[PDB]
Amino acid sequence: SRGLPRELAEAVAGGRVLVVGAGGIGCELLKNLVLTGFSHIDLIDLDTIDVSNLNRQFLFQKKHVGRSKAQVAKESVLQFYPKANIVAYHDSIMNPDYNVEFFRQFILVMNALDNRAARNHVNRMCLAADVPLIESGTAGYLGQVTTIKKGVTECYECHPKPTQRTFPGATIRNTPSEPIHCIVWAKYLFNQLFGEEDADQEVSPDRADPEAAWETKEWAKSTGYDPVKLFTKLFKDDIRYLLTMDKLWRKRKPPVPLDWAEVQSQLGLKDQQVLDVKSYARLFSKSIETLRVHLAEKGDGAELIWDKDDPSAMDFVTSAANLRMHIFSMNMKSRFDIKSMAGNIIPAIATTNAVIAGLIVLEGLKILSGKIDQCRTIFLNKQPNPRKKLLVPCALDPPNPNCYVCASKPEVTVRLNVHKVTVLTLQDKIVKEKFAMVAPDVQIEDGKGTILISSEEGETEANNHKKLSEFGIRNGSRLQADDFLQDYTLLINILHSEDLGKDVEFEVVGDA
Amino acid sequence: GGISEEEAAQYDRQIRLWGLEAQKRLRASRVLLVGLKGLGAEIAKNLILAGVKGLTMLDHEQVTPEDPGAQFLIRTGSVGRNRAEASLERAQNLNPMVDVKVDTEDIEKKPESFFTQFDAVCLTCCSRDVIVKVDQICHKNSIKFFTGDVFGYHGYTFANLGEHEFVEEKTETTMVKKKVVFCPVKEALEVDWSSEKAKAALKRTTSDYFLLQVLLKFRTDKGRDPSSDTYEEDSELLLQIRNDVLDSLGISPDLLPEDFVRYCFSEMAPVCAVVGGILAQEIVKALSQRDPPHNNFFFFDGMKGNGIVECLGP
Amino acid sequence: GDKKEGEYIKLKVIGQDSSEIHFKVKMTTHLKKLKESYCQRQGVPMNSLRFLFEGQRIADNHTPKELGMEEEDVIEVYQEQTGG
Ligand SMILES: Nc1ncnc2c1ncn2[C@@H]1O[C@H](COP(=O)(O)OP(=O)(O)OP(=O)(O)O)[C@@H](O)[C@H]1O
Ligand SMILES: [Mg+2]
Ligand SMILES: [Zn+2]
């Protein structure tokens, strides 16, 4: 604040900083930023205080449960620094109100997010604003810090990482190998009975499966939603028809069909102890019934969203998953465990975050001292690596000349049949999926620049069904996907190819 | 479980990490922490959140100015009061479940009996003499001992758990019983660089160890740590101490670059945070008896961003 | 205890959780194949891992010989945590 020393303290005081997220890392970060000197800080978060956040996020107290993180955050902080000039936004960072001009305001940006999706959006914004971005993360005892600067280092997407964990409908509906396969199976089943029927998230055995070259809200409502009726169709009839496909069942252990009748013939935490098949079969019936009773209160026509903190919902998935596992000779797991998996809960503790945040400010001080080339990705280990290092520091790498984002003139070639691929498969399986674009604005880079897809609703709605050829798109065509909010453009070279493969809509040139 | 239903939700995330039994052992441990400065507060807060049975913050020093913008556990207007008490309230709110107590007597006068009421002692800002003294009392009374400080972009943490036996986990999950042995702090600070096991490691040994030496001497010869308010005066004396101390251990003063005096003054918040979380996590491992503790020194250098675990003394 | 292509040296890739997976790679091969072999086995997104050797990052085109990888050399592995 007063000793750190002159030229540095100058920017630390006047400079304006932005912190994205006020959870574990966030709170610790604020405490430091402020104590270190930074007085002009802008906070942003889209969540409310939870009683579980009370073991690390010390800016919050029991009395603040339910309130806005960002809000309370500012309050708490202003206590041990009344002179602090803070501004908190209780809202998502994905919000279009926070455009490049907003980001270009700050001299430094720090992320404290808990998902790739946000990290991606923030990564691009800072590139567009060309403002230093300090990216971090933690998990249990592990965690890391790194710096990102357009043109200088690699961006958070020079080596693309998944925003979510995708699973093949094959091993999910036909051959579950990991316990997670059953829990996911359970979730679809949940979204197929009480939620939005997702065609992709089916549940019944698939006939058009590669492994076994063969020769469910329907069943639900047709049977009046009877647990027993269902049980026998999900853990007996379906499994039986599953065995019918002796192709997919060659060397791999075959499932064991169940029967509601037979089944009914048998200190850690309450939710840590596992129960017996029957006990779950009954929970399976008890949950379903209780679920529909709740869904009967939610207006008329309202669907249900699965939530790890919803008891009845947790009971269903827990039970459904275990029953599914038993059938596949996989050992059943407790509720506490299935909760973490179905809810992707990330084990968090204060110390681990407290470390990362300290490191963040340290890299920031360097960056503001014009010592960016001294910054580096730091890793926090649990046990000292062979060199006695608990905190592993490694240099920052240069931009990837083939990154689909930070590159100078992002461009790529997409091979696919311009006669079979619909305008939707483009805006969904390619532009949004592969290239990772949430708000696409594709157009044909031709003499007229035809608009094929628009981000704004009620415009390019009547095209999702049409064929790409219908728009004159052909071999050699050049498409331009844009995301103005992020000032991101991606030239897409179309390379027509009919005889490409099976079930392979398209394919980017550079993958295997 | 065997813990409050409420507590089951408040500690859920950490329970999903080190397990319910660990939290229990932690819920049944009292910690003594002396020195309520940056590192102090950081440490206090980390434990109070963790959920220990109770924490006693000892400090007889007054709340001198320049504390508000360095200590978040004190009120903007508390200049002139006891550093410990001043932190009480806020620290206490961090987590009601824990009983935070405050003592205001010079740790030196304290009788061996006073220390037997705690499960782990953690000192800060103390002089070597006080450090060895407490480390010695704890040993004879079978008490986990921790100490550590911060200076500029550097900081350190030491541990002496004696005959420490714990349980790890390597696999379905299976616990395994391992045992580790620590040594006196005096033996760690006074190493013989003539031994073959020494000279044959002095190379791979972080100079931060010798940095601590020099500064420890400073705290002794003088009655405070170096200060920017007296940079030149202190800088001159420091380099000198480097020569004196090092010309004794039998090593060249080169091992500690003369520029070391540029990055070792005052208390840097981010440093306290880093060092504090590391120390506080070691205390928790020792109290929950889960996972291998760092034997036995930990040196942090904010400049290069390195966290080294050294083992000196044996 | 789990080769890839050729044969000459046995490397041991240790992670942050103390896990180990010994490998036997061809003295002169794109280490990018071990990284693939690793994430394939460990079952984790390739791009989420960063392999290191004595401080330096193992470039996809790097090879044991160019790095001076002998026998029993330990390759460190680090994963990007995503909890905020
Ligand atoms: N798009 C986003 N915009 C603003 N804040 C976000 C965004 N995504 C995540 N966050 C915030 O990131 C923070 C992540 O921190 P953290 O994981 O500790 O919180 P959390 O949701 O309580 O975690 P958990 O519930 O898994 O224990 C949260 O405070 C969350 O609201
Ligand atoms: Mg979160
Ligand atoms: Zn890039």
Q: Is the CB of A356 under 6 A from ligand 1?
A: no
Half-sphere exposure of A482 (CA within 13 A, CB side): 15
Q: How far apart are CA B153 and CA B262, in angstroms?
A: 9
Pairing of strands B144-151, B154-160: antiparallel
Contacts A92 to C, Cβ<8 Å = none
Method for this entry: X-ray
Q: Is the CB of A108 under 6 A from ligand 1?
A: no
Contacts C14 to A, Cβ<8 Å = 385-386
Count other C-beta atoms under 10 Å from residue A211's C-beta: 15
The residues on C that touch A, with CB distances below 8 Å, are: 14, 16-18, 45, 47-48, 50, 52, 54-57, 74, 76, 78-84
CATH assignment at residue B195 = 3.40.50.720
Q: How far apart are CA A322 and CA A331, in angstroms?
A: 8
Are A56 and B13 within 8 A, CB to CB? Answer: yes
CATH fold of A1-164+346-396, please?
A: Rossmann fold (3.40.50)
Q: How many folded domains does chain B comprise?
A: 1
Q: Give yes or no for a contact between A231 and A193, defined as CB atoms under 8 angstroms apart.
A: no
Q: Give yes or no for a contact between B62 and B42, defined as CB atoms under 8 angstroms apart.
A: no
CA neighbor of A411 nearest in space, from A423, A403, A419 = A403
- Ligand 1 centroid distance, CA of A114 (Å): 5
DSSP symbols for A258-280: --HHHHTT----GGGS---HHHH
Are C81 and A137 within 8 A, CB to CB? Answer: yes
Q: Is the CB of A122 under 6 A from ligand 1?
A: no
DSSP element (H, E) containing A338: helix A335-342
* Chain A CB within 8 Å of residue B77 CB: no
Instruction: Give Rg (Cα) of chain B.
Output: 20
Pairing of strands B30-34, A506-508: unpaired
Contacts B66 to A, Cβ<8 Å = 2
C-alpha distance from residue A321 to each of A239, A256, B63 (Å): 14, 15, 58
Q: Give yes or no for a contact between A126 and A149, defined as CB atoms under 8 angstroms apart.
A: no
Q: Nearest residue of B to residue A59 by CA position?
A: B94
- Ligand 3 centroid distance, CA of A132 (Å): 14
Q: How far apart are CA B123 and CA B294, in angstroms?
A: 17
Q: What is the DSSP letter of A63?
A: G
Nearest ligand to the CA of A403 is 3
Q: Give yes or no for a contact between B118 and B143, defined as CB atoms under 8 angstroms apart.
A: yes
Q: How far apart are CA A242 and CA A193, in angstroms?
A: 21
Candidate CATH numbers 1.10.10.520, 1.25.40.10, 3.30.365.10, 3.90.550.10; the one for domain A165-345: 1.10.10.520
The atom of ligand 1 lying closest to the CA of A22 is: 29
Omega of the bond leading into A5 within 30 degrees of 0 (cis): yes
Whose Cα sits closest to atom 9 in ligand 1?
A: A113
Collapsed DSSP state (helix, strand, coil) of residue A172: helix
Q: How far apart are CA A254 and CA A353, in angstroms?
A: 45
CA distance A392 to chain B (A): 7
3-state SS, A400-453, equals: CCCCCCCCCCCEEEEEECCCCCEHHHHHHHHHHHHCCCCCCCCEECCCCCEECC
Which amino acid appears at position A58 of this protein? F
Show the tokens assigned to A231.
Answer: 């049980």
Q: In sequence order, what are the residues at sequence separation of 6 or more whose Cβ sits closer than 8 angstroms to the Cβ of residue A511?
A: none
The sign of the CA dihedral B158, B161, B163, B167 is negative
Residue B275: domain span: 1-314
Task: Say if residue B170 is exposed, middle or buried (CB neighbours under 10 Å; 0-12, 13-18, 19+).
Answer: exposed
Q: How far apart are CA A367 and CA A108, in angstroms?
A: 8
Q: Give yes or no for a contact between B111 and B26, defined as CB atoms under 8 angstroms apart.
A: no
Domain boundaries in chain A?
1-164+346-396, 165-345, 397-512
CA neighbor of A435 nearest in space, from A453, A447, A449 = A453
Half-sphere exposure of B26 (CA within 13 A, CB side): 28
Q: In A492-510, which positions are buried (b, 16+ CB within 10 angstroms) versus exposed (e)?
A: bbbebeeeeeeeebbbeee
DSSP symbols for A5-42: -SHHHHHHHH-EEEEE--SHHHHHHHHHHHHHT--EEE
Using CB atoms, which chains have 3+ pairs under 8 A with A?
B, C
Show the tokens assigned to A509.
Answer: 């040139």
The atom of ligand 1 lying closest to the CA of A44 is: 4
Q: How many folded domains does chain C comprise?
A: 1
Q: Give yes or no for a contact between B264 and B6, defined as CB atoms under 8 angstroms apart.
A: no
Q: How far apart are CA C78 and CA C68, in angstroms?
A: 21
Q: Give yes or no for a contact between A367 and B286, defined as CB atoms under 8 angstroms apart.
A: no
Using CB atoms, which chains have 3+ pairs under 8 A with C?
A
Show the tokens assigned to A263.
Answer: 């089944």
Report helix angle B231-249 to B208-221, nearest 10: 120
Pairing of strands A411-416, A85-90: unpaired
Q: How far apart are CA B114 and CA C34, in angstroms?
A: 57
Best C61, C75, C78, C79 member to test A by mutation, with max A CBs in 10 Å, is C78
CATH assignment at residue C74 = 3.10.20.90
Determine the CATH number of domain A397-512: 3.10.290.20
CA neighbor of B120 nearest in space, from B148, B103, B143, B149 = B143
- DSSP lists the bridge partners of residue B241 as none
The sign of the CA dihedral B291, A56, A358, B279 is negative
Chain center to CA of A384: 30
CA distance C25 to chain A (A): 21
Omega of the bond leading into A322 within 30 degrees of 0 (cis): no
Nearest ligand to the CA of A139 is 1
Contacts A383 to C, Cβ<8 Å = 18
Best A274, A337, A351 member to test B by mutation, with max B CBs in 10 Å, is A351
Q: Give yes or no for a contact between B21 and B28, defined as CB atoms under 8 angstroms apart.
A: no
Nearest ligand to the CA of A57 is 1
What are the two backbone dihedrals, phi and then psi, of residue C50, each rounded to the nearest 5 degrees?
Answer: -135, 105
Q: Is the CB of A183 under 6 A from ligand 1?
A: no
Q: How far apart are CA A269 and CA A312, in angstroms?
A: 19
Q: Give yes or no for a contact between B41 and B87, defined as CB atoms under 8 angstroms apart.
A: yes
Q: How far apart are CA A97 and CA A36, in angstroms?
A: 30
3-state SS, A102-170, equals: HHCCCCEEEECCCCHHHHHHHHHHHHHHCCCEEEEEEECCEEEEEEECCCCCCCCCCCCCCCCCCCCHH
Residue C51: domain span: 1-84
C-alpha distance from residue A429 to each of A209, B17, B210, C24 (Å): 20, 37, 59, 38
CA neighbor of A334 nearest in space, from A307, A314, A309 = A314
Q: What is the DSSP letter of B122?
A: E
A165-345 and A397-512 in the same fold: no
Q: What is the DSSP letter of A213?
A: B
Half-sphere exposure of B29 (CA within 13 A, CB side): 26
